[PDB]
């Protein structure tokens, strides 16, 4: 089966044993995490609705706490001596689902 | 010691160099403006 979870700003579709990428959390590498907000569950079992499912947590374990690839931001205006250059690396958090 | 020297706080400052690229803020026209008598080499009018 699968569930829909809200991990801050966005939503994810998760199964069991699947590894996912999210935005940075306050947990450490190795400890357990719980998703308290689940919007939909399907599969063979009875479909549950919305706005929030009563309980129905999801558990996962943290794998790595890293940053994404660097992208260079560059803009300019023609015939006007104006330009800017910036780097950026977005931090993420890796998780593996184990119990819906 | 001769290998650890330090001038007093706030006693030195680096000079400004013009005509060294647009990012400095004084790149092309070096702060003079556009096409006048005061934008030529040799200056303009007398002080009075």
């Amino acid at each position: 089966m699968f569930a829909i979870i809200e991990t801050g700003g966005k939503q994810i579709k998760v199964e069991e044993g699947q590894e996912i990428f999210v935005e940075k959390l306050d947990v450490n590498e190795g400890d357990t995490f719980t998703f308290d907000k689940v919007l939909f569950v399907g599969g063979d079992s009875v479909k549950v609705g919305a706005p929030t499912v009563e309980g129905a947590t999801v558990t996962a374990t943290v794998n790595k706490q890293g940053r994404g690839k660097k992208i260079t931001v560059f803009t300019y205006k023609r015939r006007k001596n104006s330009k800017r250059k910036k780097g950026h690396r977005q931090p993420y958090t890796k998780l593996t689902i184990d119990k819906i | 010691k001769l290998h650890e020297l330090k001038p007093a706080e706030g006693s030195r400052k680096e000079r400004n160099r013009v005509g060294r690229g647009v990012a400095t803020g004084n790149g092309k026209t070096s702060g003079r403006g556009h096409k006048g008598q005061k934008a030529r080499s040799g200056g303009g009018v007398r002080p009075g």
Partner: protein, 116 residues
């Protein structure tokens, strides 16, 4: 003392030529032409990062429209019905359910019709 060039001009010009690999003809060989195209690539990518979000929302809505028409109703009345019930599931998740779970989507079209 006299300060000459060397090992500084070549180093920064090679960095620009190395970012233009794969470009056509002299746009990956000559520094002056390559420098112009690398600036345009950065300007294009800034614009395209924000157009990529408008391109994918349109794709999901098109798929939700096709699935809903199979249940004798349009997209506009589907989103009104879900809103009047409080599903709060975004367009990205509704599209992924209609493609995969055919009879789970029918569980959501009914409640959208129950509230009219």
């Amino acid at each position: 003392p006299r300060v000459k060039g060397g090992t500084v001009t070549r180093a920064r010009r090679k960095k620009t030529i190395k970012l233009a690999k794969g470009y056509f003809g002299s746009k990956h060989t000559l520094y002056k032409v390559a420098k112009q195209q690398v600036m345009k690539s950065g300007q294009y990518a800034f614009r395209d990062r924000r157009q990529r979000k408008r391109d994918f929302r349109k794709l999901w809505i098109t798929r939700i429209n096709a699935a809903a028409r199979q249940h004798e109703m349009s997209y506009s009345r589907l989103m009104n019905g879900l809103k009047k019930a409080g599903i709060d599931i975004n367009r990205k998740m509704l599209s992924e359910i209609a493609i995969s779970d055919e009879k789970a989507f029918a569980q959501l079209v009914t409640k959208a019709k129950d509230a009219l």
